[PDB]
Amino acid sequence: STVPRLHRPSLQHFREQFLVPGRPVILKGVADHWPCMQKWSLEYIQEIAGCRTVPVEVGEWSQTLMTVNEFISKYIVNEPRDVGYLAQHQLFDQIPELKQDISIPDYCSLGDGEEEEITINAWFGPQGTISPLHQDPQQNFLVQVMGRKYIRLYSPQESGALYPHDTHLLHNTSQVDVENPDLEKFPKFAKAPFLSCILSPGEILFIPVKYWHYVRALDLSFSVSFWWS
Ligand SMILES: [Mn+2]
């Protein structure tokens, strides 16, 4: 089934129908006019951030460091040799000027945590980046700025069909490749129900705490996530 889209729902409707029961939703009309939505071209990113060092996940997975200018040159603009992803990086703490182009969603105030503790991560990469199926320990608003992403969501109630890795370090990550699952080794995966969507610019996906999610970029993409409680 498809994740529902709601236009600027009230705080109470979001709380009662999505936050408390832990149900995903896409919020429309919330982030669509944030400055980032019109301002964040590649050229703007290069002007404001190009000389700064960022962590880049390549691939055989490795983590390296390079400037934003290098990342753009090697993994976005020139016919790249491998997939590189500027993933899960607190770019807005590093570059406070960019924080002026985003806002904390008002719905985060329904949480029990402090705004000071909300973690804001950038996710910037070419078409074809993949975040394998995993779950996070806080609520998440994933705001799509540039490009589209295909997202698959499985409830925590389906965890037994997703074959989490046994190591404590990877217990929040599935052993299954969502889009080409090995059903001989992971047969229960096939019948596990899920939601999916294509998340487009200006839209926010609410990923409830511990909801399993898998993400593939369909175009050159930039997302901003807000981890909150
Ligand atoms: Mn995640």
Author numbering: 182 to 240, 247 to 416
What does the paper say about this structure?
Building from an extensive peptide-based screen for potential JMJD5 substrates, our results provide evidence that JMJD5 is a JmjC-hydroxylase, catalysing the stereoselective C-3 hydroxylation of arginyl residues in sequences from proteins involved in chromatin stability (RCCD1) and translation (RPS6). Consistent with previous reports, JMJD5 residues 174–416 fold into mixed helical and β-strand topology comprising seven α-helices, 13 β-strands and 3 310 helices. Like most 2OG-oxygenases, the JMJD5 active site contains a metal centre, which is octahedrally coordinated by an HXD..H motif (H321 and D323/βII, H400/βVII), the 2OG oxalyl group and a water molecule, which is likely replaced by a dioxygen during catalysis.
We were unable to obtain a JMJD5 structure complexed with the hydroxylated product, but did obtain a JMJD5.Mn.succinate (decarboxylation product) complex structure; this structure manifests substantial conformational changes relative to the 2OG/NOG complexes (with/without substrate) including in DSBH residues, such as the Fe(II) binding residue D323. In the succinate complex, part of the β3–β4 loop (aa 241–248) is disordered, whereas in the apo-JMJD5 structure the β3–β4 loop, together with βIV–βV loop, encloses the active site entirely. The combined structural analyses identify mobile regions involved in substrate binding/product release during JMJD5 catalysis, i.e., the β3–β4 loop, N-terminal to DSBH (aa 234–254), and the DSBH βIV–βV loop (aa 342–381).
